[PDB]
């Protein structure tokens, strides 16, 4: 019923797609950053996952924060010593945007081990706000997933949890996932996840919704499978640790498929 906003689902989808284009980071930003690297970024996002888990924040908050970080680094040269300052400030902004009960600024200062002063966090907040020109309402992988999980006639906790997980793994790795739009990554996560559990594919209903076939979703699905396969060996583990818990039904502990079929 009204919680799936039937009279509006279409219009919202159209709009989110149009918006995920404008809020897209620069694909090749990491090359034009002299002093920071995909590796350092990986550490940062992994740290936000922890922070998200420690403060029991929403997954959506985490996604937004990463969106804020990539777009800032798409405009602003940052030194390595201040990369965390940007991330703390972004998480702060996303919390304020998205959470009912955001952590107080003091707790965002606590998690940086007093690397930074409160004044620095608060000043970086304003600067982030100016650099994004307050365009904070970014469509996320989750905003697409939640809608895709709807066309999933057989509602599967395991499938829903698993897609979230693949979803989050993509946050960590600027290469390759900066070159895919959220809507795409959500589908690839959603396809990959359904198959692994039920045995099924991207449904036609979602083909008609998105205009996305498995042909057009293959490049991404390839990188994702790879990411899933290498997952236990990735230098960044917070997400796997996260999705062991009962809450997410231990989907991380599940063994990925070995072939996809195309």
């Amino acid at each position: 019923g009204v919680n799936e906003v039937p009279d509006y689902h279409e219009d919202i989808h159209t709009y989110l797609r149009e918006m995920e284009v404008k809020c897209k980071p620069k694909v090749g930003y990491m090359k034009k950053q002299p002093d920071i690297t995909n590796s350092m970024r990986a550490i940062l996002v992994d740290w936000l996952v922890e922070v998200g888990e420690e403060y029991k924040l929403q997954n959506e908050t985490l996604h937004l924060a990463v969106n804020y970080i990539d777009r800032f680094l798409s405009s602003m040269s940052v030194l390595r010593g201040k990369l965390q300052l940007v991330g703390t400030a972004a998480m702060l902004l996303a919390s304020k945007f998205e959470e009912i009960y955001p952590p107080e600024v003091a707790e965002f200062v606590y998690i940086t081990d007093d690397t930074y002063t409160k004044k620095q966090v608060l000043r970086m907040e304003h600067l982030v706000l100016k650099v994004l020109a307050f365009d904070l309402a970014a469509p996320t992988i989750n905003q697409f997933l939640t809608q895709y999980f709807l066309h999933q006639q057989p509602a599967n906790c395991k499938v829903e949890s698993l897609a979230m997980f693949l979803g989050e793994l993509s946050l960590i790795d600027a290469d390759p996932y900066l070159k895919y739009l959220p809507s795409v990554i959500a589908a690839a996560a959603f396809h990959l996840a359904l198959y692994t559990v039920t045995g099924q594919s991207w449904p036609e209903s979602l083909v008609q919704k998105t205009g996305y076939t498995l042909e057009t979703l293959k490049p991404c699905l390839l990188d994702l499978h790879q990411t899933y396969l290498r997952a236990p060996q990735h230098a960044q583990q917070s997400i796997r640790e996260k999705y062991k818990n009962s809450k997410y039904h231990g989907v991380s502990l599940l063994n990925p498929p070995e072939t996809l079929n195309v």
């Binding site: 304020k96 009912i100 966090v121």
Partner: protein
């Protein structure tokens, strides 16, 4: 920064400090300035403003107040808004004795629904629709304003902040303390506002939540599973609620025609799922003849 704005008068005071009417010295544009003090050593930019600014940035429609600029300093944020003559509440009270022409009521409700249809078609809930937050000009327009309690939602919706609408305009789903709420709550509020434009008194002026609840039942009939499935397994529902009957909208809103009464009931339906959508309501027979009259000021 603000050197080109000349303050005229104070025009309001809400979430963030005071709102002032001001005049662009160079262009002659009249504006409303909202001054938001930034907690530079404590909490920073308030979540309210992050939400209002970001959401109003996206929302560009003739029936949503235009945010024209945001002027930053180290220590303050000024939001530059278009100036509109006054809010519906002030217009209502000014019209307490003369009444509001039916054609203007219809025009106003039509525009309100157009504005609101836009907000919902853009993953945004207003959640503070009340006459004081709706602005009119002199040429016959009305606009949604004050988007501070607004929230960009996902699909499906999740649990959002429970302390949302002003009591009088609060939907039963929020009162009863349901886990999920959606676009229907904003329709409920407009429905309250339709009634109020017609009678110039608030429809459900409750002193408390329990009183608000009783006020609605008495008018629309204590709901049951046949009208509102799940109403009895709602968190704050009580089997004990007296069973009042629905009052004829011919005594509720005597001045309202057969089409009006129909659309109202639809807007005030108990069940959120069966409650009309802003989009639906835009098609309703009531608006078939809608014009754009000017208000007497």
């Amino acid at each position: 920064s603000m050197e080109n704005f000349q303050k005229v008068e104070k025009i309001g005071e809400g979430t963030y400090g005071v709102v002032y009417k001001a005049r662009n010295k160079l262009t002659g544009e009249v504006v409303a300035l909202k001054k938001i003090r930034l907690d530079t050593e404590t909490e920073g930019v308030p979540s309210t403003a992050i939400r209002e600014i970001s959401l109003l940035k996206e929302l560009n429609h003739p029936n949503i107040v235009k945010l024209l600029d945001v002027i930053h300093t180290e220590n303050k944020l000024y939001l530059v808004f278009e100036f509109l003559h006054q809010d519906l509440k002030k217009f209502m009270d000014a019209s307490a004795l003369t009444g509001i022409p039916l054609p203007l009521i219809k025009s106003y409700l039509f525009q309100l629904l157009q504005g609101l249809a836009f907000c919902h078609s853009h993953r945004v809930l207003h959640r503070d629709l009340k006459p004081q937050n709706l602005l009119i000009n002199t040429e016959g327009a009305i606009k949604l304003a004050d988007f501070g309690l607004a929230r960009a939602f996902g699909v499906p919706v999740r649990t959002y902040t429970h302390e949302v609408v002003t009591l009088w305009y609060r939907a039963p789903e929020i009162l009863l303390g349901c886990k999920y709420y959606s676009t229907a709550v904003d329709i409920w509020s407009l429905g309250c506002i339709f009634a109020e434009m017609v009678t110039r008194r608030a429809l459900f002026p409750g002193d408390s939540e329990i009183d608000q609840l009783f006020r609605i039942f008495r008018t629309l009939g204590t709901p049951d599973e046949v009208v509102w499935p799940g109403v009895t397994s709602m968190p704050d529902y009580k089997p004990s609620f007296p069973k009042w009957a629905r009052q004829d909208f011919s005594k509720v809103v005597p001045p309202l025609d057969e089409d009006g009464r129909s659309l109202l009931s639809q807007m005030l339906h108990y069940d959120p799922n069966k409650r009309i959508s802003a989009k639906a309501a835009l098609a309703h027979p009531f608006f078939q003849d809608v014009t754009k009259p000017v208000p007497h000021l």
